[PDB]
Amino acid sequence: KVTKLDRDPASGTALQEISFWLNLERALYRLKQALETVNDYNPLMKDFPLNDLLSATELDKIRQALVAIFTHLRKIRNTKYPIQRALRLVEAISRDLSSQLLKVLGTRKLMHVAYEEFEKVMVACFEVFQTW
């Protein structure tokens, strides 16, 4: 039941997958193959930094959040995560990065501001895109 539970990575946000792979480990600590799978995958799941992205309001904060996330993606070498699953994770980061972007531009109200301020905020946003 608990040992047979699995989740499609193509759906949901990234935080849902982080919460799944953390609380599955915590419930398994409370069978052998599931244990070694989550023990293999737990170096990725620990201290994952996308709460910085979700808490970011300024574009430079977003940019340092994605470089923190991508530098956290270095640790594939010690785990045996599925590669298509990893692609669905980085697709999920793209998803809530987009969501935070429409949130930020909803605060910014680009059409109701002058040309110059719109220019600096969108070249900052395109710097974020280039960094991505």
Side-chain angles (χ1 to χ4, degrees), residues 102-118:
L102 319 89
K103 189 248 278 188
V104 160
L105 297 186
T107 88
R108 213 56 71 114
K109 46 182 53 73
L110 309 173
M111 300 334 277
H112 306 355
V113 85
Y115 187 79
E116 307 56 8
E117 302 95 308
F118 161 71

Side-chain angles (χ1 to χ4, degrees), residues 3-131:
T3 53
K4 253 182 61 76
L5 180 174
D6 207 307
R7 179 191 194 223
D8 164 48
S11 155
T13 78
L15 82 81
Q16 269 164 303
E17 185 85 5
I18 298 306
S19 76
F20 158 70
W21 280 105
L22 276 187
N23 91 304
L24 194 71
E25 168 111 356
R26 198 214 298 269
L28 277 198
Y29 268 137
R30 264 167 188 169
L31 190 60
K32 159 161 165 177
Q33 34 260 52
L35 246 185
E36 55 67 25
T37 302
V38 301
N39 178 39
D40 184 28
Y41 290 173
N42 207 36
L44 297 146
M45 316 327 321
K46 290 192 276 176
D47 55 87
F48 223 58
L50 69 141
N51 94 95
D52 178 26
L53 204 147
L54 294 176
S55 70
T57 66
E58 306 312 289
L59 303 168
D60 42 336
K61 316 279 137 284
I62 297 155
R63 214 197 71 257
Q64 60 219 27
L66 319 89
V67 303
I69 280 153
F70 271 102
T71 36
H72 211 141
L73 256 290
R74 160 57 277 170
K75 45 192 57 56
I76 314 300
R77 59 155 185 132
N78 43 297
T79 83
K80 313 300 141 197
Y81 211 63
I83 307 75
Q84 276 69 10
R85 198 166 253 266
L87 287 179
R88 300 292 94 79
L89 326 186
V90 47
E91 276 252 25
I93 329 304
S94 157
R95 278 190 283 271
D96 48 347
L97 160 75
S98 157
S99 84
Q100 194 93 350
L101 269 170
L102 319 89
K103 189 248 278 188
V104 160
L105 297 186
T107 88
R108 213 56 71 114
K109 46 182 53 73
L110 309 173
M111 300 334 277
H112 306 355
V113 85
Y115 187 79
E116 307 56 8
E117 302 95 308
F118 161 71
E119 200 60 46
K120 293 140 295 272
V121 316
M122 76 69 72
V123 298
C125 163
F126 271 62
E127 191 216 347
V128 163
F129 282 161
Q130 187 57 49
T131 317

